[PDB]
Amino acid sequence: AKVYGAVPPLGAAQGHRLLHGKREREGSLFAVANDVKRDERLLRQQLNALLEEERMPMQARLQRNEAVSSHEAVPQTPLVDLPGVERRRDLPADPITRLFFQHKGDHALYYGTYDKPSVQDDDRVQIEKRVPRRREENLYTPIYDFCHRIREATEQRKRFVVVPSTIETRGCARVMHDHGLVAGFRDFHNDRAFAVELKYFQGDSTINVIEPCSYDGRTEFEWSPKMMRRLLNTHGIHNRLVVYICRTADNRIIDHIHAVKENIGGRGLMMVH
Amino acid sequence: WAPQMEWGIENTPSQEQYQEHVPDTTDADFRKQRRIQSRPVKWFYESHYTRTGSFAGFQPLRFMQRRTEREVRWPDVINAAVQIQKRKPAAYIFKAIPE
Amino acid sequence: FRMSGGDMFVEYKVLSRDHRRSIRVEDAIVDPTFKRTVLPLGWLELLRSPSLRLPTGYFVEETVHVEANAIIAGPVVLYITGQSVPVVLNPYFVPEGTWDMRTRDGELDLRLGMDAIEQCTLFSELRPGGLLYGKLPENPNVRRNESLRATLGRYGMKCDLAESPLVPRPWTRMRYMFIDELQRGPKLTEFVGHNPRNGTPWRFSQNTKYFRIGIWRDTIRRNDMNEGLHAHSSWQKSPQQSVPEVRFLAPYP
Amino acid sequence: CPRCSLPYSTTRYCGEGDVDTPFRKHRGRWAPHQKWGREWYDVVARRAEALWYRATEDPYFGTPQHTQRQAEALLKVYVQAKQRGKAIDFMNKLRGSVEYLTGDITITTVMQESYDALLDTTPHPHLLTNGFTLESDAAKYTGEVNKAPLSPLQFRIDMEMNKYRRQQKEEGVVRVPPALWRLDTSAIVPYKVD
Amino acid sequence: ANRTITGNDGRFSKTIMINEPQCNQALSAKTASELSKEIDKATNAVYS
Amino acid sequence: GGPGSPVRGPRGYTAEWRDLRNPMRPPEFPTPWERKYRQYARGQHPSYDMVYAGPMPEIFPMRRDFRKPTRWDFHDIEKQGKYRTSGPY
Amino acid sequence: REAFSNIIAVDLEQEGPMYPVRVNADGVRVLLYPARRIVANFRVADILCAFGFQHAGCRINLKATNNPKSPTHTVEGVFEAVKALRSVSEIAASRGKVPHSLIYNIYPYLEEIRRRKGMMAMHPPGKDGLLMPDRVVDNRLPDHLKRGYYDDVYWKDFFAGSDEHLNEPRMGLRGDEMRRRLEEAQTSPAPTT
Amino acid sequence: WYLQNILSLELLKLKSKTNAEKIATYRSYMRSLASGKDNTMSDDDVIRNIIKERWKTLEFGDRNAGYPCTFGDYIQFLNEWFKSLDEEGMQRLREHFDRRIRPLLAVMSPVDILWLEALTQNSPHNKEQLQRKIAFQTSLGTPEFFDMSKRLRYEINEDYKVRDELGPELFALWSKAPERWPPERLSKMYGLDFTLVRKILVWHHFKACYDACVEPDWSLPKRLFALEWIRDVRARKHGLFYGKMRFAEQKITFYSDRFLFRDLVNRREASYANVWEMDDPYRFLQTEQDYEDYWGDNYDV
Amino acid sequence: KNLNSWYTKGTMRGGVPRIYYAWMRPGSFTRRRFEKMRNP
Amino acid sequence: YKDRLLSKQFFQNPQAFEVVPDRNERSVQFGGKWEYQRTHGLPTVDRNE
Amino acid sequence: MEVYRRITERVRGALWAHHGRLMSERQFHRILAFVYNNKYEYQIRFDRMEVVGREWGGRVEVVTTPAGFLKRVRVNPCVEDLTLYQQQQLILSAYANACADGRKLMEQAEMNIYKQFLKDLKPIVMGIRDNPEFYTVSENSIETIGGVLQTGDSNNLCHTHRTIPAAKARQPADEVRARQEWEQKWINSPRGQSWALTLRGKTYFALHGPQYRPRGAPGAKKETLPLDIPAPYTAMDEKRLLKKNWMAYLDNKHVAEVMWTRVKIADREKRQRLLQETGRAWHRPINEEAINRW
Amino acid sequence: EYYRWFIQPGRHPNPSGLT
Amino acid sequence: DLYPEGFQWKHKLNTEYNQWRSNTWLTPDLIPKEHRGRFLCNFQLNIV
Amino acid sequence: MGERMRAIIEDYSKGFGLGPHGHSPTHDTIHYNTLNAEGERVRDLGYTD
Amino acid sequence: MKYADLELTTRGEFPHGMKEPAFVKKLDQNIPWYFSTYRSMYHWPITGDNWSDLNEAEKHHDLHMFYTLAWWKLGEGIFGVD
């Protein structure tokens, strides 16, 4: 009749308050009140800590587990390494057959901006920014023209699309690539435009429709978390089919799924499915 | 365990069911599709844990629905599906006794 | 579960209600004489798991005399190796002063109680002919000396299982097993009403007033397609009538 | 009436004279008195079964272990509702109960004699019991006005024949007993009537 | 994370490319660990 | 408690470095933790998500649902009249 | 006949669309959207019920007064909208992603991978399971030995009338057995020859 | 009539085969030579056909006439037997009904109205006219095609027949110890999908319990479909409905084809002391919510 | 908590019957073409 | 094992061991509605053997 | 598993090809299930036992199970003076040694399992090969519409073998009954009683004494003759399938044919690899006259 | 209620119901 | 399952199945050639 | 009827195994008995001992 | 078993359910929209574990099965060896 997991079967010195059953000794009414308050505070803190541990996400749990696993009793100091093993390697490209040259990151000084690009990829044509001609005409936006160029290329059954290069457009392309609606994308470090390789399935196109949220840059739309969750809720059934792009206050272009997951609301960009 | 669902065949009364009065009999009820209904106390013999509450957060489509519109304009006789009634008799009966 | 020396040696594990802390015993004597199981007091704090449902480790924590010499704490879950159903208990925790459980070098002399036995399949061993029937305490309603055959004959047993021709064979109770995928395929399920689990699968019969004209038209002009509501009825000009529980993926017919 | 618990002589409609009658709504119709039958006997049996289950399921009024008072009340319900096989199975499960093994609940002679009286009164699925009575017009089919319509020795012969048929169907052949095998019919007591 | 292992995934075929032209495609310890992770992830993918 | 709530705010070894110990080293207090919970707490236990469950098959056939009588199923059509019958039930 | 030639069908695993689909057949704008119940005009709702949809809503040209409005347009617009519907499985395949509702099929694979620990992972240390026919063996025997080979272990005349087992099918047969076959074969064309 | 025809097999006298027929049947039955005649049938089949013909030839009418028993006597005996039937007999009768009549009720057609009437008709001349017309219809088509009994001929999954499934696999070996036989071991016998093999295992366990005349484990289907039971409970909690979740009411989400890697590495690098710890039936339950969703069905636990 | 009830869905069309699939399509119920190795 | 199995079978169907059986219905159970959790299964032999 | 499945598929394919008989799919999978349960029981026995691995002389000791479950670790205090990475690598090496010992034991036990499986499968092979109508042809023989031609290929070196005697009624049952008669004669011999009273006789009667086992004891109660199931004379599943439905018969025939073709392809590729390793076969096809000339 | 078991369904002896 | 099996049973002909369990068999001329012996369910005609 | 019979006959009469070229009779690339080459070989060889 | 000599002159009609109805040339109500637009209260199958003082579904099924077997002569003689 042996047991496991407990080296001492029982504690001779360790007893119980109820087992002792000694006469209750109270210092005073103030002491009783202080004891009640401190024990209820301890219980509340324990409950809150337990709830937080339950609510801790998987990423945090795995990071904490790895940290404690690799923990050392001594805080080891960093060592000197080679001149560089931490540089961000440039993405591969073919110099001969290319839409644009993959300009390396060491020329960040030479790089310009979307409005005033520097002279590069002169062998190719340059995408001119859309500009309204009259007041009545809608104020076009890079998101709008990117969406319409992608839609037109999809309808005309094209492979590569040259689209304007902004942070929001690159984030939208990255999200579409993550969701698989786009075969791939590449941000050649050209100030004006980058490349997107489309995807087709069963002769038709895997992208059904793309629509920018706002036609004018003058009007700006904000998406509340409830308005985002209404998209997920489809007459009582969870639905992640249609994809919505939002840009938050942290300059992080995400999708409505992650926006709902972290309970944040950013400005909308486009709807694609 | 399935709770007692509201807006059912037996829960709803006659006017809410068909906008007409039917006799409320414990037996011989062809309309309610039952033979004999001897009625004990609702939750006496049944186990307590089997009683899980009730649910009424929906719309009774026969009784009340959103956007009550006419199904088809012509003929004018037909109306929304919420109204299912039989033809009204003419000169039903008269009572000689004053009362 | 093994028999040696005339008693049942069972190995099990006792775990907290949230199944965080667990202590497994390799051998325990199944003793029906004890009303409820007894555990050492030292295990109280080694099984106290302050979960969220229970702010304290145990829902019930009181003191009893078996003078207030033991602690009743629980609930605590218990998994017997030979049992497929967990048993939840409120065992006695006894200090060393009232009772020393250690007997040999590493043996705690833990004996399982009647409350734990009656909740698992070992209760069947308390019936006549069981292993614990000989160790049941003296009572006028049980005589351990007499044999199982004698007890069953007293209760009414005359012959063995289904020896008489009148009683049917026990193995003839179920001659067939109904698995849809192994014969005739799945079922053609329909409904009339709001929801598939709300309406009924019975389509209205051929006697409906809205269907009689269509049925008559079909009977007259059987060689054409007649428009109407009669197609919704269970009567169809095709030999396969639309009735509940019809196998439509079956090879034949 | 099993439905309304009203006497048949004084009342004809269920729920007459009762303030809290659930069988009479505001614009409903009176329900005629129901006559006793095996359907209502089984209704009462099922109500008793539900009560027995709740007696241990209820955490407020229920007891951790059943009571001999509850057991004898259930036996009284069964005998008064004339549930023969149900009472037999209840008695067997009472014998097999854990509380019976512990001896907390004991089987008293009043329960034993009530069970015996129920068994005698209720008709038997195969044989005949004290409840069965001799009938007059059955002579048209039997031929004997006094003797009971069942021969125990013929029933024994048919039982042996059916046993041999079962053996033949089970094995495919039959094993012939030796020529010295004589059928035993010493204890076959003829049906003696009152 | 260091943009040394690159991946192109079709409907069913996954190609993994090592891109270390500065070191003549030489793998460090961290690079080799990441490459092993990518290899045993792409091989153990359902539609691979 | 979401982002709309007001913000919570923010050489050697610090004070919280001393209590942290490598799990390889034996624990200070040998609490008999369940092995399954130990694996599950660090995100290493094989996760049996509900999505891995497929259809719940019907083991035994429930019963035969016979055609129950209704106002639209009568041998004679005389009792199905606009003055008497407005629907099956 | 034209309807049966142009007949179509939809995937009913979803019982209704999961995304708004907007089309126009002959200028009539038709929108089909997910809904709790079948909410639409009587004719298009009956068309959807015939299609088997249970959670859908169809709208043509907004308010009914809006032109064009004709029964042919009403039928063809809703049929075009239903035809232009993409199923969830098809959308998932086009995106190249595994649906949430089909990953239960991998559970036996994962279970077997987890249960391959220990002895189940072992293989015969020395045998690869493939064996080559290095030598050629024959067990054919002459007819005289075939007749008497199985006198003891089996019954006498084990190869009695077997056509494939014996070189001579009728070898070892008796008069009645030969006569049955010959009589059948000769009395089938009794009056012919 | 039932006793003297269906029962009382001692006086049944079938045809006695000659010596040559006995020799040939012995050869064919003991060892089958290829291309042999398959028309020959076993004596059990002959007896079953005899009983079937005896049932079929029964026709009601006047007792003094050629008809053995009348419809009144038939219904009286049937009603009295049905009243006398207890729960066990009623269960066996329901099993027989589901085996025999229920598929016939499902597959019956109005074209067989006259045959269905002739099943227990009162023998008019109209039935004779209908039989002559049915003979004409048979001449038009095929008799064995146009009859009720042969409608249910072919079934899917011919490899695993219910006749073979009636006998549980390693029944005694796993009955001695249920702990040593998790469902994986028994399911290794079959080559079907997971749901099908689990259904087969549940059916085999229930058949074994019924044969042994012991209480079957009603929680065994729960333990085999523990993931399915939890999924259904949580689906009923999320969607305000009661029943079994179906495909049309399931969430739509698209994961990457390599989404399973995180769980796959855990499963591939998991290690266990014993094998019962590896294959315990409660490994699906981790938190108190899981335990509640699993054990919320029975009140005792 | 998804107050939209799955139990109360659809409209009663009177006596118009419609099929509802249990788990999957009857067309993909059986896969003999791969189980019995009938594929090219 | 034989006597354990006999006891289980007798407590399941006591009518099967009678020469002339009586009516057999199902009555109440002393172990609640889930007494199969304690009465189910064939008798079990020891794991050491 | 893999090897056992290959063997069973080869057995089924050969059984269908040589004698035109069909094995039930249930019977096919039953053998694999028996092998799996045998491995399961071996694992059940092995998890009880324990293995020890040692690293750095005796500085590091790891106590595990043959499956590889960590149970105990004992480490000399001097090892803790080493850095964490070195300690991790030492523990990993000790666990690797323990895994190596467990692998040795498990592979020996699995060879035992393989021998048991071959012994169980013996009756089927002997019944499909030991019948008077069974023959094969050399693989290098040209096959045509009518029959197989025979190339020379050193026909003097080539020798056809026969595994069945022309003597009447020679069977494993006859061999086993001869063995039983011989052992009974030895027991009844005058030295037999002395040998039976000797410890050797006691051990022999304890092991091969099934008729002496009391009722209720595990194991067979008698020694029975081996299985005699000849393929060309016993109907297995083909007649039942043909009588029931033709589609299932055709499907099972197709499955058997595909399995036989697959095992033949496996044998051909193994022979090709052996030839390439020997050096008699080139790495790329050079002789197209043996493929395209048909 | 026992009259229906001894009558021809088509035959109605007195549809009027008046003597 | 983009392209499922369907009804791969040849125990009866396509025309036989159409006759047994379909309305389309009674109107051979209306059904086109490509859908001749394919349908297995009764159809309702609604004339708009 | 003709299509069904032809399909059944072809399915029953199809061969299997490995031929003189060591490939399956229905191999994707190579073929066997092209233009009755084996037929004319058997015609010009025969079976005469 | 109680028995008395009685004769049931008219047995009845087979309860198959597929019988040719009495045909009407003119329908009383010419509107077909009522059938398509009819609605009724929901039929909840199970409410509170489905407990009744008398079993409804089981007893109704048994009573249906009794006369179904009576008209199908216990389903014996129809089937044969397959």
Ligand SMILES: [Zn+2]
């Ligand atoms: Zn009353």
